[PDB]
RNA sequence: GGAGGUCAACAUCAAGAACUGUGGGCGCCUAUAGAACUUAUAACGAACAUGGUUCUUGCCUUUUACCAGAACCAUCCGGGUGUUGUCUCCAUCCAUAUUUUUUGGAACUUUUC
């Protein structure tokens, strides 16, 4: 159990997350969890109106995680 | 094509997984891998591969009833009669195999069996040139020695990941019969010893960089491999992983809870011994010592294993091997450990970059192939290449280049050969291939003619892509040949056959140099006795069918001196004065060591293409080198170093610049040869003191004048600087029992050099490590003198590292000393005697 | 337990999922989560069909199991 | 368990899958997990609408996966 | 049926891939014969003796004697296997209600074709 996922290669890089309720977020990947709870900094919503926030996303919610730039 | 395949398929001995999945897997760059196997003499290498082979193949065709059971180790990859009869691996034979791992994701693995005899290090270098990582196999009894240090040094130097295997553990327990408490200690010592030479990384039976095995018997361990297989079932999975961290070094568990405290309370042991070594011992004791009925209960109780009576009806050794292979299943601990130990991103740019300039441009969509070794298979000569990029297929027209040419770096440049076929090595058979993809190593038919030894294979469709492309650097073999044989055929009329054969030998043996004398005699250089012996055997048997005369083993000498010039052109307009100087041993050593100047390491002069300020910085930093002289370093020779040093360098530097290459070309030309014996010069620095130039240079300063003039001046300078001869020396690694020491001492005295650099008790065994040095000219037969005088006990290896030529005793130029023919030269002069015998051969 | 589940091995099965879709094919591998592996699979969304091949379903997704035919030789 | 090892063995090949989302993803698989996480490249998504897109890198949660679709040679693999 | 038979008879006898011929069974498989290549002549026997011929060493130029090398053939003492008839003895896979599966984000409504 508790296989600590392979998110070492995403640390301190920009992301394009998707979550439950078709809502999505951009941010710098700070830290991750056993259950895939995430720490994002410089968090910006994608409503198309983009609101700056500054965030801990829950693990359950997460659908996926992308990279903007190669 | 299909017909060929159908016939071919019958030949090969089929396998359990099948080719199709193994062929199927290839496309991913990440999937699959390249691994080489090295280690000192009889470390087990070949038999380790044999283990994998026997796991994979159901038949096997070759096995005798006898061998399959026990006593004679089956040898695969020893497909050469010479090797079989000699009994030691000589020429490397690949095995390619679809292997599973603990995760259950199979990958294709290219394995390379390299020879561990010190004379065939060249073979190891060739393997390394292709392999991603290396498995270094150490005998638990032998421990580590000089060749191990050399091997790890080079391996890491070339960014080859290193995973250790400590083999013959059974011997430690059965041969030496060591107690478990002491056994652990001995292993730990070995582990420590490897680590100190290694820099920046630290292993441990807990990082899974070290594997424990007995090839002979039939088993391989990692501390991970064991825990999952037997312990894991016993306890909750979450906890177990930690168990391994609490398994190695300083950890004891009293009764469910384990405390780092020494062993308070009564009976005590650290865990490794508790859960591993003790039961292993019990297995040994229990199988041989125990009634065969008793054993069954334990197999069902402890292991859930059930043997038939036919498994009991063997004998101690074959029974034991059966049981160990029974309990410890296919060697996937090994495979798994390999799998999760290499990261492509970290090494790969570094390993590619070193062979080639850093670049990099036009990546992808382009064919690229490094050709290393060539292979004398049943049919013809095959070419072995590493799929650097793209894809190969049958009949593909491929451009081919040879490295020395590359050294050099449009129409005329490109020769090409179509690729007739590609096969995948499997020791004794070759599996037919339609196409080859980047990552893998393959056998090519028909690319051979373009290249002798190494070559770089590329296909470029692009003019910019072509410009970017960097040719692979010449492989740097670990040792220099030194040993010298003169050949002539028995009957002179058969010369053409000899000539052909010699060329073939150059293709097959990367360490051989064939030179042709005025006389038509053939000078052969090889690394050492055994090496050359094998060449001669193949030459007389396999290639030429001609009986030939062979001379008395000699050695290549080197010229030198220890501390002014006047000179005149054939058309007296030029006049040259050049100083000749002894060089600092530090400097010499720095030059001998091929390096990039990385870490704190003194920069290798071949880094001269970098800013002279930097080059001069190194000289000033490491030597307190004169600032003008350091700035005036022109170039190195084919060896030592050239400096500009006079007022006319300021008077007419532009004029002088026009003549640099003519000088530059000449000097390699002049130093490559020599005034005493036409032999190359060492430890000598030259400084231009004066250069007169013809009034109005009416195309007067021609290469036809100055090149030979310069050459002459060098020769004169060397002579007036008091020349000496240098002789190459081996490092003598001798392993013996203590009371045989005095014998060894006497042998050294008798040979000539009689020098022993160090004596080290081999902790854990009844053996000494003896390091000495010996003059190659006095080396003929040395090894047999040892073997015979010690009554078969102990052994010797001669290895050329450091490549240091010591001053030959006597003055280079005195007539008086020598005494008549057939008498070994008196000690006062070995320099004068050496010149005359060589002098006569020159003319 | 899982004694019954091994008995189903290598039979053509009709598996209804939470989505309503129904997969069909032989059963090669089975789990404690009820992860099923199925060979030569065909969905029937409903007058419809699709060819997939090897399909690995989760436990969350599966509703019911039912044998279509006996084990093949 | 075998239903997880089969997955790990299709790493490298191209895979199709379905999520609770409703969309299907297709691409080369780089890494998997016992959880059923995934890491893929050059993905070609196709939702309920039919809308195609490109995603360079992706991570997933297994909980969100419905089912996978795996290459054909992965039926001769050992169980 | 079984073990053992110091009982015999009759066959063969290193192993392996590949060519040709014959026979049987439904292009494939099995058996037998011949030729070529490999292993190391790993050994049919962890033993090893005599003789014939042809050459090359010593000889009285003679032997029913030899010296000590070579090649080619033979004999002799043994061994294995199958088969057939006999003989004696004996029987006829772990247990988790709190984030990646099994203690639910479900429930419900409406419009379009
Ligand atoms: N006692 C013992 N010896 C072993 C074991 N494994 C290998 N050896 C030794 O390895 C030798 C045979 O192994 P080979 O693989 O043929 O030799 P090698 O390691 O290939 O040697 P090279 O060909 O020179 O590399 C035997 O003489 C053994 O002494 C082991 O587990 N126990």
mmCIF file of C-alpha atoms and ligand atoms in Angstrom, chain B residues 39-48 73-75 78 87-90 113-117 139 167-171 175 213-218, ligand 1:
data_model
loop_
_atom_site.group_PDB
_atom_site.id
_atom_site.type_symbol
_atom_site.label_atom_id
_atom_site.label_comp_id
_atom_site.label_asym_id
_atom_site.label_seq_id
_atom_site.Cartn_x
_atom_site.Cartn_y
_atom_site.Cartn_z
ATOM 1 C CA UNK B 39 36.293 -9.083 -13.665
ATOM 2 C CA UNK B 40 39.745 -10.669 -13.100
ATOM 3 C CA UNK B 41 40.740 -14.295 -13.927
ATOM 4 C CA UNK B 42 38.127 -16.989 -13.626
ATOM 5 C CA UNK B 43 35.933 -14.717 -11.533
ATOM 6 C CA UNK B 44 33.012 -16.709 -13.017
ATOM 7 C CA UNK B 45 31.915 -14.333 -15.757
ATOM 8 C CA UNK B 46 31.254 -16.954 -18.434
ATOM 9 C CA UNK B 47 29.459 -19.295 -16.047
ATOM 10 C CA UNK B 48 27.248 -16.447 -14.830
ATOM 11 C CA UNK B 73 30.652 -26.335 -15.519
ATOM 12 C CA UNK B 74 28.830 -25.992 -18.796
ATOM 13 C CA UNK B 75 30.488 -23.322 -20.858
ATOM 14 C CA UNK B 78 33.420 -20.486 -25.037
ATOM 15 C CA UNK B 87 40.392 -23.103 -20.466
ATOM 16 C CA UNK B 88 40.184 -19.305 -20.231
ATOM 17 C CA UNK B 89 37.804 -16.918 -22.074
ATOM 18 C CA UNK B 90 39.742 -14.974 -24.719
ATOM 19 C CA UNK B 113 31.237 -11.882 -22.024
ATOM 20 C CA UNK B 114 34.579 -10.076 -21.703
ATOM 21 C CA UNK B 115 37.884 -11.855 -20.883
ATOM 22 C CA UNK B 116 39.359 -11.282 -17.486
ATOM 23 C CA UNK B 117 42.891 -12.254 -18.298
ATOM 24 C CA UNK B 139 35.833 -13.450 -5.927
ATOM 25 C CA UNK B 167 30.946 -14.612 -6.293
ATOM 26 C CA UNK B 168 32.000 -17.989 -4.880
ATOM 27 C CA UNK B 169 30.433 -17.407 -1.455
ATOM 28 C CA UNK B 170 30.125 -21.183 -1.100
ATOM 29 C CA UNK B 171 33.930 -21.385 -1.257
ATOM 30 C CA UNK B 175 36.773 -24.232 1.201
ATOM 31 C CA UNK B 213 26.229 -15.525 -5.705
ATOM 32 C CA UNK B 214 27.707 -18.954 -6.430
ATOM 33 C CA UNK B 215 27.800 -19.488 -10.157
ATOM 34 C CA UNK B 216 29.169 -23.023 -9.858
ATOM 35 C CA UNK B 217 26.394 -24.101 -7.484
ATOM 36 C CA UNK B 218 23.552 -22.129 -9.049
HETATM 37 N N1 LIG F 1 34.488 -22.901 -5.715
HETATM 38 C C1 LIG F 1 33.789 -22.184 -6.629
HETATM 39 N N2 LIG F 1 34.412 -21.823 -7.775
HETATM 40 C C2 LIG F 1 33.760 -21.107 -8.714
HETATM 41 C C3 LIG F 1 32.363 -20.725 -8.467
HETATM 42 N N3 LIG F 1 31.969 -20.032 -9.548
HETATM 43 C C4 LIG F 1 33.018 -19.975 -10.408
HETATM 44 N N4 LIG F 1 34.086 -20.620 -9.909
HETATM 45 C C5 LIG F 1 35.411 -20.760 -10.567
HETATM 46 O O1 LIG F 1 35.320 -20.415 -11.951
HETATM 47 C C6 LIG F 1 35.988 -21.380 -12.764
HETATM 48 C C7 LIG F 1 35.139 -21.686 -13.985
HETATM 49 O O2 LIG F 1 34.402 -20.519 -14.331
HETATM 50 P P1 LIG F 1 34.515 -19.911 -15.813
HETATM 51 O O3 LIG F 1 33.339 -18.997 -16.051
HETATM 52 O O4 LIG F 1 34.814 -21.040 -16.768
HETATM 53 O O5 LIG F 1 35.818 -18.992 -15.710
HETATM 54 P P2 LIG F 1 35.684 -17.425 -16.010
HETATM 55 O O6 LIG F 1 35.216 -16.741 -14.751
HETATM 56 O O7 LIG F 1 34.946 -17.212 -17.306
HETATM 57 O O8 LIG F 1 37.213 -17.050 -16.253
HETATM 58 P P3 LIG F 1 37.553 -16.169 -17.538
HETATM 59 O O9 LIG F 1 37.048 -16.941 -18.730
HETATM 60 O O10 LIG F 1 39.050 -16.021 -17.480
HETATM 61 O O11 LIG F 1 36.804 -14.888 -17.278
HETATM 62 C C8 LIG F 1 36.201 -22.618 -11.912
HETATM 63 O O12 LIG F 1 37.557 -23.055 -12.020
HETATM 64 C C9 LIG F 1 35.903 -22.196 -10.487
HETATM 65 O O13 LIG F 1 37.103 -22.253 -9.710
HETATM 66 C C10 LIG F 1 31.750 -21.152 -7.184
HETATM 67 O O14 LIG F 1 30.565 -20.866 -6.909
HETATM 68 N N5 LIG F 1 32.513 -21.862 -6.346
#
